[PDB]
Write an enzyme that holds these catalytic residues in place. Structure first.
Site, PDB file in Angstrom:
ATOM      1  N   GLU A  33       0.819  -1.210   0.000  1.00  0.00           N
ATOM      2  CA  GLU A  33       0.000   0.000   0.000  1.00  0.00           C
ATOM      3  C   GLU A  33       0.855   1.263   0.000  1.00  0.00           C
ATOM      4  OE1 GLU A  33      -3.098   0.431  -0.475  1.00  0.00           O
ATOM      5  OE2 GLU A  33      -4.030  -1.519  -0.116  1.00  0.00           O
ATOM      6  N   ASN A  84      -7.749   9.037  -5.542  1.00  0.00           N
ATOM      7  CA  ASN A  84      -8.638   8.102  -6.217  1.00  0.00           C
ATOM      8  C   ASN A  84      -9.439   8.809  -7.309  1.00  0.00           C
ATOM      9  OD1 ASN A  84      -7.888   6.081  -4.299  1.00  0.00           O
ATOM     10  ND2 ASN A  84      -9.367   6.982  -2.870  1.00  0.00           N
ATOM     11  N   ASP A  97     -12.598   9.064  -7.831  1.00  0.00           N
ATOM     12  CA  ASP A  97     -13.768   9.822  -7.402  1.00  0.00           C
ATOM     13  C   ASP A  97     -13.415  11.116  -6.675  1.00  0.00           C
ATOM     14  OD1 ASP A  97     -12.828   8.938  -4.976  1.00  0.00           O
ATOM     15  OD2 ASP A  97     -14.715   8.042  -4.316  1.00  0.00           O
ATOM     16  N   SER A 148     -11.588  11.291  -3.831  1.00  0.00           N
ATOM     17  CA  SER A 148     -11.101  11.008  -2.490  1.00  0.00           C
ATOM     18  C   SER A 148      -9.598  10.722  -2.529  1.00  0.00           C
ATOM     19  CB  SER A 148     -11.855   9.827  -1.883  1.00  0.00           C
ATOM     20  OG  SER A 148     -11.632   8.645  -2.629  1.00  0.00           O
ATOM     21  N   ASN A 190      -8.886   5.690   3.239  1.00  0.00           N
ATOM     22  CA  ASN A 190      -9.585   6.522   2.262  1.00  0.00           C
ATOM     23  C   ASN A 190     -10.444   7.596   2.927  1.00  0.00           C
ATOM     24  OD1 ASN A 190     -11.003   7.476   0.009  1.00  0.00           O
ATOM     25  ND2 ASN A 190     -11.242   5.429  -0.865  1.00  0.00           N
ATOM     26  N   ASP A 198     -15.649  -4.202   9.440  1.00  0.00           N
ATOM     27  CA  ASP A 198     -16.867  -3.701   8.808  1.00  0.00           C
ATOM     28  C   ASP A 198     -17.552  -4.714   7.897  1.00  0.00           C
ATOM     29  OD1 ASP A 198     -15.501  -3.805   6.348  1.00  0.00           O
ATOM     30  OD2 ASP A 198     -15.774  -1.684   5.886  1.00  0.00           O
TER      31      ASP A 198
END
Ligand code: NA
Length: 129
Positions: free
Chosen positions: A35, A46, A48, A50, A59, A101
């Protein structure tokens, strides 16, 4: 800060990531490697709009507030810049919420594509842990 492999392993273990939600320590070190290359200051944008922050590339779409991701959530209740610190506490505590999550470590694309299904224990070989 750019961590050494065993230095990061030891710090992740101390913060309780070893076998957290069933993921052995090697999974977390492998994820950090691909990462961020173990660099707490890593950032990536990213598509979008973000941005991903820190050693585990968390994120701003869902997890932190960077002031430039309108309409997003802040589920770890932190400014995204806190995730760039040499102190990895905030990254680890937010990662614990992410992995809980429902999707596990599949949330990290680099883990699924480069760590899942490999001998992840190799990433802690040689370390005094
Ligand atoms: Na956000």
């Amino acid at each position: 800060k750019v961590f050494g492999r065993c230095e990061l392993a030891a710090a992740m273990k101390r913060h309780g990531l070893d076998n957290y939600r069933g993921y052995s320590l090697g999974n977390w070190v492998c994820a950090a490697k691909f990462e961020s290359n173990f660099n707490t200051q890593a950032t990536n944008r990213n598509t979008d709009g973000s941005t991903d922050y820190g050693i585990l590339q968390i994120n701003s779409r869902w997890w932190c507030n960077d002031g430039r991701t309108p309409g997003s959530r802040n589920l770890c209740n932190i400014p995204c810049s806190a995730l760039l610190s040499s102190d990895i506490t905030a990254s680890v505590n937010c990662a614990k919420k992410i992995v809980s999550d429902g999707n596990g470590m599949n949330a990290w694309v680099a883990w699924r594509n480069r760590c899942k299904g490999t001998d992840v224990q190799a990433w802690i070989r040689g370390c005094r842990l």
